[PDB]
Design a protein around this ligand. Structure first.
Ligand SMILES: CC(=O)Nc1cccc(NC(N)=O)c1
Ligand SMILES: CC(=O)Nc1cccc(NC(N)=O)c1
Ligand SMILES: [Zn+2]
Ligand SMILES: [Zn+2]
Ligand SMILES: [Zn+2]
Length: 461
């Protein structure tokens, strides 16, 4: 057992209002057959359209909530409303963005374009995330083809689309003009064992996604509940995720900014103790610094921000009021005034940051971190940390091509002396790039209000 056996049982109670009379005794094999697909006793990399929870979790970047509603109602084929967690609603006729009624042959083209544009920078596949009541599963034959695992007609990537026009296969990158989703995956969240309907289960955990009673709304709620179950209530930091973007540069930048900012604060205000609050694996980011370095363990909160009352009180320099507190992606309700803070802004648009549960976002960079909603009120005792570069390293090249650097924010012996040296200019520009990377990836930096870079100039005399 690595994949989901097609001979696994499927609970059909969810299905029986769109599909009256459905057998109680039902496997994936009989269900895939009922959906009009033929698995043609095939050992070719696609053993089941349906996947385990573990497989879905490994493919979270591929998740698209999908819901279909009998627009007209339950011989008599009537219009269907197709909703996706992208906020798209399509109406298919048999003849919160809301499109007029069109035949399947044009609806299927729009489905490929939408999935391709959403997923090409995210994933090698699609995982349709369902709260299955019947119409979603019986609609698939009209826009899905299955068969052996194939590759793109223009690259090495696995095929995700098929064209009836040209009888060829494409990935998400190369699918323009393709009309069928090829070898999609799917998970029915109702199989996980809930009481009561989607809204009632979704609304236990999340107040940000309403019900307009359109299909896209159920599609979003279904994916939200799935993220809640797999990344909020349950958490797995062993699971690794592929590089799809600037992960490595962002992580390098984060290390360089943390060392820079913490080193500068210790030099400027000479705190006798630093309280390092957060990752239990955390290492001294300024190993040479005089200070008393005291660590406090807190795993990433994935549900609600930690309450400062529980982190601190219940009895350590015990006095967290002594020296400075370092919260480096340790998300709390309200930072103390004597803090250095890095806080991920869940609202940022990137390929690393997926929509999450209850205003939170799912930040996927090597591991998946469901991050509680960014809240500006957490930072009331602090101010934004302005950009600066600080170095006491000697002015000395070794081994670029130069416009001489002029900057008020290049805090070096050489800038003090009137003229930035070439070494410090190269380092400044590398640091500014790293900084810009980290910010644009969605990290925000906050500091105690007395922090002033003017105090760093006298650390050279
Ligand atoms: C009760 C009812 O509408 N049934 C049904 C079943 C399958 C497809 C469709 N319609 C379609 N536009 O494909 C309708
Ligand atoms: C990168 C991100 O957004 N999340 C993250 C990463 C490492 C540690 C923590 N938090 C902790 N309290 O250990 C959170
Ligand atoms: Zn391709
Ligand atoms: Zn929600
Ligand atoms: Zn210099």
């Amino acid at each position: 057992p690595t994949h989901l056996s097609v001979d696994t049982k499927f609970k059909t109670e969810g299905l029986c209002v769109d599909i009256p009379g459905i057998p109680k005794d039902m496997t994936y094999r009989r269900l895939i057959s009922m959906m009009g697909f033929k698995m043609n006793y095939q050992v070719n990399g696609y053993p089941n359209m349906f996947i385990t929870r573990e497989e879905a979790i490994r493919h979270v970047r591929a998740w698209i909530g999908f819901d279909v509603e009998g627009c007209h109602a339950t011989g008599t084929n009537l219009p269907l409303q197709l909703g996706f967690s992208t906020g798209v609603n399509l109406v298919a006729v048999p003849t919160p963005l809301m499109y007029k009624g069109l035949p399947w042959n044009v609806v299927r083209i729009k489905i490929v374009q939408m999935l391709s544009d959403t997923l090409k920078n995210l994933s090698d596949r699609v995982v349709f995330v369902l709260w299955a009541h019947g119409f979603e599963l019986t609609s698939m034959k009209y826009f899905v083809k299955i068969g052996p695992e194939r590759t793109c007609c223009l690259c090495d990537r696995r095929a995700t689309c098929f064209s009836t026009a040209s009888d060829t296969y494409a990935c998400w990158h190369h699918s323009i003009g393709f009309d069928y989703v090829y070898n999609p995956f799917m998970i029915d969240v109702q199989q996980w064992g809930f009481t009561g309907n989607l809204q009632s289960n979704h609304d236990l955990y999340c107040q940000v996604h309403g019900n307009a009673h359109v299909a896209s709304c159920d599609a979003i709620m279904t994916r939200c509940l799935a993220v809640h179950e797999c990344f909020v209530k349950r958490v797995d930091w062993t699971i690794e995720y592929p590089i799809i973007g600037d992960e490595l540069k962002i992580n390098a930048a984060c290390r360089k900014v943390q060392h820079m900012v913490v080193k500068a604060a210790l030099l400027a205000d000479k705190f006798p103790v630093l309280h390092d609050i957060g990752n239990p694996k955390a290492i001294k980011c300024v190993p040479q610094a005089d200070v008393e370095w005291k660590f406090y363990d807190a795993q990433p909160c994935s549900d609600k921000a930690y309450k400062i009352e529980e982190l601190f009180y219940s009895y350590h320099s015990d006095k967290f009021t002594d020296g400075v507190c370092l919260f480096w992606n340790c998300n709390v309700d309200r930072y103390p005034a004597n803090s250095i803070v890095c806080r991920f802004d869940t609202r940022v648009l990137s390929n690393l940051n997926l929509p999450g549960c209850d205003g939170g976002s799912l930040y996927v960079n090597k591991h998946a971190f469901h991050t509680p909603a960014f809240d500006k009120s957490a930072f009331v005792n602090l101010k934004q940390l302005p950009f600066f570069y600080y170095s006491d390293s000697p002015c000395e090249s070794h081994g670029i091509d130069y416009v001489p650097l002029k900057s008020a924010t290049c805090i070096t012996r050489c800038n003090l002396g009137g003229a930035v040296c070439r070494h410090h200019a190269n380092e400044y520009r590398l640091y500014l790039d790293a900084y810009n990377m980290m910010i644009s990836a969605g990290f925000s930096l906050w500091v105690y209000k007395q922090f002033d870079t003017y105090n760093l100039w006298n650390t050279f005399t």
